[PDB]
Amino acid sequence: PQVELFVKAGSDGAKIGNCPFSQRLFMVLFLKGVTFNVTTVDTKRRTETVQKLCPGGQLPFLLYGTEVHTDTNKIEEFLEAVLCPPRYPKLAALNPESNTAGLDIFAKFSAYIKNSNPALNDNLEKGLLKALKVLDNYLTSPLPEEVDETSAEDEGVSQRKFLDGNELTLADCNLLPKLHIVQVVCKKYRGFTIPEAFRGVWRYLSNAYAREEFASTCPDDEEIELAYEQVAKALK
């Protein structure tokens, strides 16, 4: 039941370019265990075969047998439905709040980085910091799984690896690619690093970069930066 995910090509028209939607889906497929392959699509120069499978020009899309599926959320939702137990595992989060913790982070970042008027830099940066703290608190709050089970050093603090427990879920597939863009781009163009004092968020990124499903699906730093260069370099 052949699985082909079509994703945005980077600056040389071949390699992985910047796209959080592509990476999220790429991650879902590694995590599912399915046999699959990825085709990169140069969005300035779609091949004729790609033009014909996705006449609308959406991206990413997914070839499943002979059907093309568009819209990332619906693609994901369909991968969860059709690649299901017992032959593949359920990836969706158990706790609803895991799907919405730090959702706002990527919008606040975008605002922050598209802005070019120095007067606004500070308030937008605090927007971003606050969104990261909501996330941090969610990462340091014990989930129901962890109830009343701790050791003396770090009572009240969670020790789970990812958003919803110790297994990557769908919620991580959405968040991690976005946070990864936030870090690379804000470091390069805004003199900004996620504060060390958000130890949840750091401990979380550490656990992420430790898993090939995420680190193998990241675009090269240079592709992310090039991708954001025009919009980001405008603030003087």
Swiss-Prot record:
Establish whether keyword Phosphoprotein is in the entry.
Answer: yes
Result after altering residue 32 to A: Decreases glutathione-dependent oxidoreductase activity
EC numbers listed for it are: 1.8.-.-, 1.8.5.1
Q: Using the record's annotations, give every residue carrying the modification S-glutathionyl cysteine.
A: 19
Q: List the disulfide bonds.
A: 19-54
Q: Cross-referenced PANTHER family, in alphabetical order? A: CHLORIDE INTRACELLULAR CHANNEL PROTEIN, CHLORIDE INTRACELLULAR CHANNEL PROTEIN 6-RELATED
Name it.
Answer: Chloride intracellular channel protein 1
Species of origin reads: Homo sapiens (Human)
